[PDB]
Design a protein around this nucleic acid. Structure first.
Length: 255
DNA sequence: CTCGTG
DNA sequence: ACGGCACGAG
């Protein structure tokens, strides 16, 4: 009943997350950057109808807000083989080219796994749901990711933008990783016996035995939920000696 | 749809 | 030495 014991920790019961201890993010532009407003290639009604519900949900959650901005990038209707279930995919390439680069601190999976001792064979794998959306964007940086949204009937006039770290932004992975590392620094200190690996939104908790893996997992779940993050109950792999993590199958300390 | 990569 | 062309990705 791991789900019932930690309602606030699961995306299924705790609602959309929000990293309350993290200050809204300010995105520095390169020294020569000036706003660019790229035209929206007219979208077919089909793509527009598949995307509508997603845009409405995001608006209700406050993840998206109306705005007027000198910046504007294309919205694209990416989908599965067919005409069913779409999703809003933004082309932030002209924006990415204009924001100042940061040192990529997220380690590659190979080097990250090398830090897993053979002594810790009891694993718990958690996948944070809508990770980037948990980090707020400072109002001064929000205009940067604006895009056009139209709907014949009543609703919005033109541009919408994000209030949270969006998808497609080149620095989202790194900024989320560093943010979660700051939020879990304490947890690592209070649990010296545990091994916690972080790869953006993919987490692996390692323990010496089955008990302290259960007690540690309870602790991480409690902590994650309190901090405003949300783990997917569906994918969760709790206290197993065999788990799927970052493409590998961990067992006997192999791979 | 628009790019970058090979 | 090209430069059209899958393929991946925002």
């Amino acid at each position: 009943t791991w789900l019932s014991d930690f309602p606030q920790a699961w995306a299924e019961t705790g609602g959309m997350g929000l990293a309350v201890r993290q200050a809204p993010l300010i995105i520095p532009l390169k020294a020569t950057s000036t706003p660019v407003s790229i035209k929206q290639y007219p979208m077919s009604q089909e793509a527009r109808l598949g995307i509508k519900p997603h845009i409405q949900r995001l608006l209700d959650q406050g993840i998206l807000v109306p705005c007027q901005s000198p910046w504007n990038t294309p919205l694209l209707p990416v989908k599965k083989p067919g005409t069913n279930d779409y999703r809003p995919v933004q082309d932030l390439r002209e924006v990415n080219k204009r924001v100042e680069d940061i040192h990529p601190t997220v380690p590659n999976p190979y080097n990250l796994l090398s830090g897993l001792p053979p002594s810790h064979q009891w694993y718990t794998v958690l996948d944070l749901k809508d990770a980037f959306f948990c980090l707020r964007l400072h109002p001064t940086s929000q205009p940067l990711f604006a895009f056009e949204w139209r709907d014949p009937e009543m609703g919005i006039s033109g541009q919408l933008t994000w209030t949270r770290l969006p998808q497609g932004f080149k620095n989202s992975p790194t900024l989320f990783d560093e943010a979660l590392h700051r939020d879990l620094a304490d947890f690592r200190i209070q649990h010296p016996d545990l091994i916690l690996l972080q790869y953006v939104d993919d987490l692996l908790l390692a323990a010496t035995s089955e008990l302290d893996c259960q007690q540690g997992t309870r602790a991480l779940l409690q902590t994650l939920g309190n901090l405003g993050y949300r783990a997917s109950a569906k994918k969760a792999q709790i206290c197993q000696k065999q788990v799927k993590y970052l493409g590998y199958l961990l067992k006997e300390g192999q791979r």
